[PDB]
Design a protein around this ligand. Structure first.
Ligand SMILES: Nc1nc2c(ncn2[C@@H]2O[C@H](COP(=O)(O)OP(=O)(O)O)[C@@H](O)[C@H]2O)c(=O)[nH]1
Lengths: 318, 33
């Protein structure tokens, strides 16, 4: 028994919340058994196809041509072969089509401009390992399951023990929940782990939003750690997708997100800046004390270390 | 208010066509084809 710690995950869609939870089951539990991994074989195939299709459609809306005029048919084949195949079924022809498309320079050119439209951050992952996924005897690795994207049916909760502590990690994902359910999450919460997708800094905003995921996150985070009702609740910042951010900061300047930024386009100086933008939203220099972390939710080794650090901080506060 | 907060939470964390299994809706050939 000893002590029980309640954790609550916040953060905009696609910020890595579900991933963190799935990490806990891998790190501080028995992970996924060979059998459990076989269950996701279907969704893995799906997400793969769903990704390539997402890019192909983008090529039409962005008016991008194929590097090879021959791929045109393959694009058509894709939807047909995908309209005709099923779950737990990966034809060598379909994989071949997806593969050739994933190689096309035009498709790549579109993939590079994935900031101008909505695309999942598991696309490149699967599309790269296509040859392995396509295999008949293929069984989703533990890292594969980690990358899967399924329909979040309501509120998820995971139990696990670590350093003589009983953790209960809650995550409300996508599911629009009533005022009632939310209260039961904020109640007794030892700490809130707020997740921010660093790579969202350069994304072109949607046609229905008034700002952008980054600023939306800032507006959310603001109300959170500034709400008097959370005074005793410890705030933990997870600046996530640091790896993708690093690759983006090379060609996409931080000025696109923060115009008043006069620093160099380096991962180190930009990330430090973003952190400050969030931490400066805390109108309590004395009271509140934000615990920031630059994480890669898909990197187990990382998450493990980060969470270990978080743990200590919680034990210390006694 | 807390309602405002809950409202914000709902719209910010609100989910698209790249989750779960395939659907006959995601398989519609784009117009330029
Ligand atoms: N490269 C990279 N990908 C990530 C990271 N965190 C999440 N992702 C990917 O982003 C996708 C969606 O993240 P998810 O956890 O479902 O977002 P959320 O549940 O709405 O908070 C997942 O399929 C992950 O593969 C990261 O730190 N680095």
């Amino acid at each position: 028994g000893a002590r029980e710690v309640k954790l609550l995950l916040l953060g905009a869609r696609e910020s890595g919340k579900s991933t963190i939870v799935k990490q806990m089951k891998i790190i501080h539990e028995a992970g996924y058994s060979e059998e459990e991994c076989k269950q996701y074989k279907a969704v893995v195939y799906s997400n793969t196809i769903q990704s390539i299709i997402a890019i192909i459609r983008a090529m039409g809306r962005l008016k991008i041509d194929f590097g090879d005029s021959a791929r045109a048919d393959d694009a058509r084949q894709l939807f047909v072969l995908a309209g005709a195949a099923e779950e737990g079924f990966m034809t060598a022809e379909l994989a071949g089509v997806i593969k050739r498309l994933w190689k096309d320079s035009g498709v790549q050119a579109c993939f590079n401009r994935s900031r101008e439209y909505q695309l999942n951050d598991s696309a490149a992952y699967y599309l790269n390992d296509l040859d392995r996924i396509a295999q008949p005897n293929y069984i989703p690795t533990q890292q594969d399951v980690l990358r899967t994207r399924v329909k979040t049916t309501g509120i998820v909760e995971t139990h696990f023990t670590f350093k003589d502590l009983h953790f209960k990690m809650f995550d409300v994902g996508g599911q629009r929940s009533e005022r009632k359910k939310w209260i039961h999450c904020f109640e007794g919460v030892t700490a809130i782990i707020f997740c921010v997708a660093l790579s969202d800094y350069d994304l072109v905003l949607a046609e229905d939003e008034e700002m952008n995921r980054m600023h939306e996150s800032m507006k959310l985070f603001d109300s959170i750690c500034n709400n008097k009702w959370f005074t005793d609740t410890s705030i933990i910042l997870f600046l996530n997708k640091k790896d993708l951010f690093e690759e983006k900061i090379k060609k996409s300047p931080l000025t696109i997100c923060y115009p008043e930024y006069a620093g160099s386009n380096t991962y180190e100086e930009a990330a430090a800046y973003i952190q400050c933008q969030f931490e400066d939203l805390n109108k309590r220099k004395d009271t509140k004390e934000i615990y920031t972390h630059f994480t890669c939710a898909t990197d187990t080794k990382n998450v493990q270390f980060v969470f270990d650090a978080v743990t200590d901080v919680i034990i210390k506060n006694n | 208010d807390i309602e405002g907060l809950v409202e914000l939470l709902n719209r910010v964390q609100s989910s698209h066509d790249q989750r779960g299994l395939l659907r006959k809706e995601d398989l519609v050939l784009p117009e330029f084809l």
